[PDB]
UniProtKB/Swiss-Prot annotation:
The first BIR domain is involved in interaction with TAB1/MAP3K7IP1 and is important for dimerization. The second BIR domain is sufficient to inhibit CASP3 and CASP7, while the third BIR is involved in CASP9 inhibition. The interactions with DIABLO/SMAC and HTRA2/PRSS25 are mediated by the second and third BIR domains. It comes from Homo sapiens. The chain holds residues 241 to 356 of 497 of the full protein. Monomer, and homodimer. Part of a complex composed of SEPTIN4 isoform ARTS, XIAP and BCL2, within the complex interacts with SEPTIN4 isoform ARTS and BCL2, SEPTIN4 isoform ARTS acts as a scaffold protein and stabilizes the complex. Interacts (via BIR3 domain) with DIABLO/SMAC; the interaction inhibits apoptotic suppressor activity. Interacts with HTRA2/PRSS25; the interaction inhibits apoptotic suppressor activity. Interacts with TAB1/MAP3K7IP1 and AIFM1. Interaction with DIABLO/SMAC hinders binding of TAB1/MAP3K7IP1 and AIFM1. Interacts with TCF25 and COMMD1. It is linked to Lymphoproliferative syndrome, X-linked, 2: A rare immunodeficiency characterized by extreme susceptibility to infection with Epstein-Barr virus (EBV). Symptoms include severe or fatal mononucleosis, acquired hypogammaglobulinemia, pancytopenia and malignant lymphoma. BIR repeats lie at residues 26-91. Expressed in colonic crypts (at protein level). Ubiquitous, except peripheral blood leukocytes. S-Nitrosylation down-regulates its E3 ubiquitin-protein ligase activity. Autoubiquitinated. Ubiquitinated by TRIM32; leading to proteasomal degradation. This is E3 ubiquitin-protein ligase XIAP. Zn(2+) binds at residues 61, 64, 81, 88. Residues 23-38 are annotated as: Required for interaction with SEPTIN4 isoform ARTS. The lineage of its organism: Eukaryota, Metazoa, Chordata, Craniata, Vertebrata. Multi-functional protein which regulates not only caspases and apoptosis, but also modulates inflammatory signaling and immunity, copper homeostasis, mitogenic kinase signaling, cell proliferation, as well as cell invasion and metastasis. Acts as a direct caspase inhibitor. Directly bind to the active site pocket of CASP3 and CASP7 and obstructs substrate entry. Inactivates CASP9 by keeping it in a monomeric, inactive state. Signal peptide: none annotated. It comes from the Eukaryota. It is found in: Cytoplasm; Nucleus.
Length: 117
């Protein structure tokens, strides 16, 4: 439970000292991936604050302080990340909440299979 789930942060400090653009640079990110993961990752991640941790094609945010490994279809890091959590510093700094809001939510469905649409 830690120092009171309510008097702590519902977790052992998720943000592991993020906001480290010094090493999260452009060539720093791509460099991590050692040109192995999918294509279009250069601008994709470099712009969304995603860098390679060491898994096979997986990714995580180094500027926001959160992970987003591959466990679903191709799903561009842009869409996948925004759904993972809108409270990601850099992530928002790029396409603002207007985008993340459009992503996380949906185009109109938001019914899950159909429900009542
Ligand atoms: Zn993030």
């Amino acid at each position: 439970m830690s120092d009171a789930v309510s008097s702590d942060r519902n977790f052992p400090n998720s943000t592991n000292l993020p906001r480290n653009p010094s090493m999260a640079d452009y060539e720093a990110r791509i460099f991590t991936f050692g040109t192995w993961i999918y294509s279009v990752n250069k601008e994709q991640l470099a712009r969304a604050g995603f860098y390679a941790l060491g898994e096979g094609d997986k990714v995580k945010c180094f500027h926001c302080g959160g992970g987003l490994t591959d466990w679903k279809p191709s799903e561009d890091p842009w869409e996948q990340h925004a759904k993972w959590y809108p409270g990601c510093k850099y992530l928002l700094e790029q396409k603002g909440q207007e985008y993340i809001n459009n992503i996380h939510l949906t185009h109109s469905l938001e019914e899950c299979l159909v429900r009542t649409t």
